[PDB]
Curated annotation (Swiss-Prot), chains A, B, C, D:
Increased expression of eis due to point mutations in the promoter region of eis is responsible for resistance to the second-line injectable drug kanamycin in a number of M.tuberculosis clinical isolates, through acetylation of its amino groups, which leads to inactivation of the drug. It comes from Mycobacterium tuberculosis (strain ATCC 25618 / H37Rv). Effector that is released into the host cell and affects host immune responses; it negatively modulates inflammation, macrophage autophagy, and cell death through redox-dependent signaling. Acts as an acetyltransferase. Acetylates 'Lys-55' of dual-specificity protein phosphatase 16 (DUSP16)/mitogen-activated protein kinase phosphatase-7 (MKP-7), a JNK-specific phosphatase; this leads to the inhibition of JNK-dependent autophagy, phagosome maturation, and ROS (reactive oxygen species) generation for enhanced intracellular survival of M.tuberculosis. Can also acetylate multiple amine groups of many aminoglycoside (AG) antibiotics, leading to their inactivation, and thus contributes to drug resistance. Is also able to acetylate and deactivate the cyclic peptide antibiotic capreomycin, but not the other anti-tuberculous drugs isoniazid and pyrazinamide. Acetylates kanamycin (KAN) more efficiently than amikacin (AMK), even though Eis seems to bind AMK with higher affinity. Does not acetylate and inactivate streptomycin, apramycin and spectinomycin. It is an enzyme of class 2 (transferase). Disulfide bonds: none annotated. The gene is eis. This is N-acetyltransferase Eis.
Amino acid sequence: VTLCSPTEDDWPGMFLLAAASFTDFIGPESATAWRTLVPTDGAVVVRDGSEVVGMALYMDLRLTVPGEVVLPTAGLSFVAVAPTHRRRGLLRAMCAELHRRIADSGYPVAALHASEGGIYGRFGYGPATTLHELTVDRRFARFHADAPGGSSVRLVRPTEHRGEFEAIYERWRQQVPGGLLRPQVLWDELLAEAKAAPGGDRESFALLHPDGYALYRVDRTDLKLARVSELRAVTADAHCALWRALIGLDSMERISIITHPQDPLPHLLTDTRLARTTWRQDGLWLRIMNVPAALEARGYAHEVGEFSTVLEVSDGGRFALKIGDGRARCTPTDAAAEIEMDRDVLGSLYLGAHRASTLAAANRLRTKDSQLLRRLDAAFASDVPVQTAFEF
Amino acid sequence: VTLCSPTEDDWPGMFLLAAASFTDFIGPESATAWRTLVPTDGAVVVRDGSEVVGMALYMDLRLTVPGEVVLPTAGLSFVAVAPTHRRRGLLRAMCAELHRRIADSGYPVAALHASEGGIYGRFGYGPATTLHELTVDRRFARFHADAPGGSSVRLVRPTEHRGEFEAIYERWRQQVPGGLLRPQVLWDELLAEAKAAPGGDRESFALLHPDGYALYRVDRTDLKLARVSELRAVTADAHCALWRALIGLDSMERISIITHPQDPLPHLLTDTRLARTTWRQDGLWLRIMNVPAALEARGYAHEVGEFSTVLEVSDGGRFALKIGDGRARCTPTDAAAEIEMDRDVLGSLYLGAHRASTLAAANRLRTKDSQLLRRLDAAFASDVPVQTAFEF
Amino acid sequence: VTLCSPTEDDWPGMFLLAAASFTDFIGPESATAWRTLVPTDGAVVVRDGSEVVGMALYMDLRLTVPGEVVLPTAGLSFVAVAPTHRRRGLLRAMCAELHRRIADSGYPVAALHASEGGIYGRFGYGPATTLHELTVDRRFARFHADAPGGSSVRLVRPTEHRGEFEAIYERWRQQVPGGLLRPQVLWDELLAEAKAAPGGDRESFALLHPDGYALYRVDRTDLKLARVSELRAVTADAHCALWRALIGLDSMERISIITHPQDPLPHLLTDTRLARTTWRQDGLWLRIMNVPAALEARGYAHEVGEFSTVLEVSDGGRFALKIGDGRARCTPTDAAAEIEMDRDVLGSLYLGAHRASTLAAANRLRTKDSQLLRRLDAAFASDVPVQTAFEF
Amino acid sequence: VTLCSPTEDDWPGMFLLAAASFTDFIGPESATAWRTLVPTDGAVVVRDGSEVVGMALYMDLRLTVPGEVVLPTAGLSFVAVAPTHRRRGLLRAMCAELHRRIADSGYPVAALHASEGGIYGRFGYGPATTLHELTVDRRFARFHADAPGGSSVRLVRPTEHRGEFEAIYERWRQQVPGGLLRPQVLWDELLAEAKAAPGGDRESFALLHPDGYALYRVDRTDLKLARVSELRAVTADAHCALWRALIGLDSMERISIITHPQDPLPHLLTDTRLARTTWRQDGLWLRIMNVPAALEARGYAHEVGEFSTVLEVSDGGRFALKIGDGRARCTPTDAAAEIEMDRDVLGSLYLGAHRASTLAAANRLRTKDSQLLRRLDAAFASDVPVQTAFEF
Ligand SMILES: O[C@H](c1cc(C(F)(F)F)nc2c(C(F)(F)F)cccc12)[C@@H]1CCCCN1
Ligand SMILES: O[C@H](c1cc(C(F)(F)F)nc2c(C(F)(F)F)cccc12)[C@@H]1CCCCN1
Ligand SMILES: O[C@H](c1cc(C(F)(F)F)nc2c(C(F)(F)F)cccc12)[C@@H]1CCCCN1
Ligand SMILES: O[C@H](c1cc(C(F)(F)F)nc2c(C(F)(F)F)cccc12)[C@@H]1CCCCN1
């Protein structure tokens, strides 16, 4: 039971474990695409001796955090342990080795999407974005008198406007916390999935505005449901225009989208209740690799006045943290801690999705100063609400 | 088609329209209870000539708003138009007359629970609290190592500990935005509903801590589901202790509760995803009757520095609004408006449930200054998350 | 295994078999009511020796047939064979004896409601009315510009307007084919079922017009469904007014009614499709006891010119049938048959629910003359569409 | 926003809007087929400037009406407005232009199948046929002793007997109201849909009689349900023989068919209730383009004696209407109207699906003479029950 970087001879064993572990799994054509994102020592395998019984890798990503700051981010993916080798510590050993390599390589953060919610907390990952599904009964939906755009939107084939989607998405990712650079190879895959599959998904159409797009398709089994796979809007006007067009899908009963908790959609309608929350789940998980580099890198709210505290991360260091004029300075200290929390809690607070006070109520964040808690809450808040870019 | 205060002879016609309009409706024994809360000129009826075809009333309530400030609040309830008299403007005429009486009586706010989401916006009511149902698959739930109370909780009969529930609830309502004084007569009704009904609900039990209680019952049809009707916890320790006891209902598969978006429950567990959001809806709706009295009455966040603006409410006045040291001064002005919004939008922002930026994205709040928007957001935020007291 | 009229000592054994055979079965309080309708020799029981293993009876009823003619009608009911005595010919023997008594007593027709569709055909009964359930999605329902009554309807308690329902129902039954006289004791039972039952049905309300009424209640399990138990309208204006009021049940999603195929409801709306047919079944079954007395008694369409034919009923006689000026003369003959059909087919054609041509296509009605078939079709048609009065 | 006949360059924009608007939509291979049926100026498009945002066309069809008379019929199809251009009057403008062209071209009637029931009434279209789904629990089905054919039916592959289906269908359409000529290109499409699709429908089989055929297939998800796509029988013997064979599908639990209200199937069985009505909906919609040409063209019932009246169609002319010996003469007059109705009501009465009395009860047809109403009812009735040919 040895742990190594894979050789070319290991990859067929990895694709076998992939097919058996992941239901989304196409086959080794999307492998050319995603492999480019994996750097030279970005993968580990466990062999028994001798076949592949475990694998994990990271991709080179670019993540937007509050203040429109873009961090090099190690994106863990393709994580699998053979069903024959459970409870042997393989996941723990693979995560320890990748974290060592990520830290040494100079990444301030790592990120992942979690197949289950109980695994990655113990490895320092905290849920950092929230997926919010809205289902609109569009037969009753009337726009409020105040709603913009009372058309600049066109109904188009996705494949014929790749360049415009690419340009709108690039503008969106730079300005929104949670934003990820989407490389050419993931656009190739997005348009692949957008064409009809025999006994699979129906054709996708696009609604295209100068400052936004929506990709949608009719559900396989339900022909009265349109699923919005993705809506990226750089302006409020674009967002409202796109929703006017989606509510115009007159043959549909329901429009569903996976969005964020602060989606203004409900406020565009005379009946806010028509935008029903049908599902909520953790999106992106963050592990802060380097506490001072992460805390210094992001912007903080300008509204809160300068304050100083001492933050301890459990087995992650203790730091003099000074926050003012929307900037943090974060320096080593042995002075007494005023705030203690595990590494995962800091990742949950990093993009502004979770309030420090809510975590403090659960005892995940500990302080004897309620004023410092209100100050953390306000400082770590995000002006621009955090969204989920794409699963990886 | 005349609109008057009811006489004693009108009340049987009102109870008939009630039975036909409301499915929750017991009969005129809960009528003795709720009638005490209705002040002398707190009810209107519409007669055709000549039976009752429309009715509406308000109750005298006490609502906690941010800063632990308690406002006299007019609670609209028992609103009904006969199915024979729809589209005759009866609701509009009844609301106009009650609002006139409420304003003249000196109430700064009115409140209601909405049977549908598309009605009350046009009468100046904005949804001000959010109901969030969590369903816990308690068979998988393990408490986090950080969770307090790793018992001070007793399993009791509700009827034998009325006094302790009353005392814990009183402490909770005073310290939480959304809190309502619960009068003796609504405690009488709560314990009535807590006893088993033949072909109705199962018996309710209570979990009692010095600083919290939960009322729960097994579902009628589903014997593996326990429904928490109400959990009031004054301390984090009480909340965690009560949830340790609810997760100990070993014969149940699922625990469901209607709570608020900031309920720390998910953070108490090793798998946050086990606390699934199964339902979200508007709770309390607010109509600000007097803008300056409401805006001056509540506390604002101390973290945001002193600022000055001009707020216009559409057909509600224009005001010089100065906010600093957590207090607002709100005075008449004819100076140019920097912020415009309808009366309903102000009610939605009053308890801190909705961000000004989210409403601005929908064009419900209008400003040409993004800095003023961040300042409104931070100032109107609530340190203590807003909760829903009880339906009326 | 003897077949007799019951004695007083037989009735407890009959109520036992009733409880075990019928799920609708209240107990012997509705027995006082229905027993009055049973004439002196109107019941048979089968004893084994020695308990009751079979029973059947008829009631004295008054049935409206085309031409507003009212026939004495023997209504079979309370028919049951013990589960211990199936396949012993008990039903056949009980039906043969009751038919002998009914024929000898001078009834021209017998009638029943069938628990299953495959039993009573072989005893000469044909389905004669059609139950048609409409479910209206009332949230989309808009009345057509042409619809009358663009209120004369009141929302009332059934128990307080018994006399007005009685008077409207009496007018309806006399003018509609399928109409039955409803005696005092069946009004007693109707109002019993109209009050709320603990763990049973919700309270019933009434919509009362000078020329019509609807009884409705909210469904037990579904609180968004109102079930119309009964709507009797003497004029088109009443029918439309009552439906305007039912569509005003704003808290309901759906209104369901068991009506007839020619209910004009769909034509009152801008979208006829909103009145969905959710269920269709046979209502009243007729056995013609005396062919000449039945055929002479009813009115025929005045539009068809005088014609003469020879009708044979299989083991029921052969008759010279002359139809003109809406009257039939029906006299014995040994001349060659031009039309043959079983007794059940004549019952199906008697109230105009089933066309002769449709039965001829199935070979239930046989003729070598297609002109005679068109003539039968037109003559047996009913100006006033046939409806179902009440189950017995 | 201009409205024109499409050019070749418009057709790709039309196929895009088609794919997005219609879920049945194969792609531009069925386009070669259906395009032949579209005459030279039979299509309109709306451009924004500049892409296609709206389209509509008609096909040249041949519709059988009562009296076995075949009318040139303009069949509206491929009607779509882009979801970006709702509420701009595009449908109204496209329908006005096509109606102008259809009227000028000399079509007495237009027809369509409606995606929703609330659209086409306001454009003069009335539902003229009724779709009736029967589901037979074939495990209980026994044929009545009177049922013909107590085999002349063969189980065959559709593709190998195209010529025999074509010949049987041609005989059926000529003799049945609702019948449409089915051109070569729609037979090409029918056999395309009859072969198994990977992840789509199962193979179709045929039951072939000299005077009838049934096409059926096992349902995708339900393997105990056989769906009859089409059953055309020229004789009663063929219809019964085909149903004997379908009831012989011993591996099936249920047989479902979309048929008409007068399908004799239920009468072929000992238990009529086994043929359950699971669904009812409008089939073909008719707009009478020229009232006198339509009313003169069809046959009327010979049973009703000669009568004369004055019919007004709202904005459609007033006419002296004389009906006798199954023929109508329909001439201009300014004499007082005895009957008024909108154009849509006449289309609903044209094929005999809807009675004048039922429409009169809804006030869609207005007269002060009840005798004239009985006369209209009998005269417009159809000897041969109206059926639905095929969707377009
Ligand atoms: O589809 C993504 C993916 C696929 C494949 C493929 F199966 F095509 F070879 N290879 C991936 C790789 C690769 F193995 F390095 F190529 C890295 C990251 C994601 C990959 C994964 C699959 C499961 C978990 C989330 N996305
Ligand atoms: O149960 C509450 C209530 C009941 C009754 C009763 F039906 F017992 F006479 N009366 C109420 C009254 C009363 F009519 F003034 F007594 C006011 C407010 C709420 C009442 C309402 C009923 C429906 C809407 C929300 N709570
Ligand atoms: O409720 C009707 C009914 C009830 C009862 C009762 F159970 F109350 F004694 N007795 C009935 C009688 C009676 F037995 F003669 F009293 C006749 C007809 C219907 C009766 C029946 C019961 C099942 C079949 C249709 N209606
Ligand atoms: O399938 C029928 C149809 C298809 C197509 C196709 F998409 F193949 F090019 N073209 C049609 C045309 C055509 F566009 F003129 F070719 C006319 C009428 C029906 C057509 C339509 C499609 C939706 C509404 C009812 N039948």
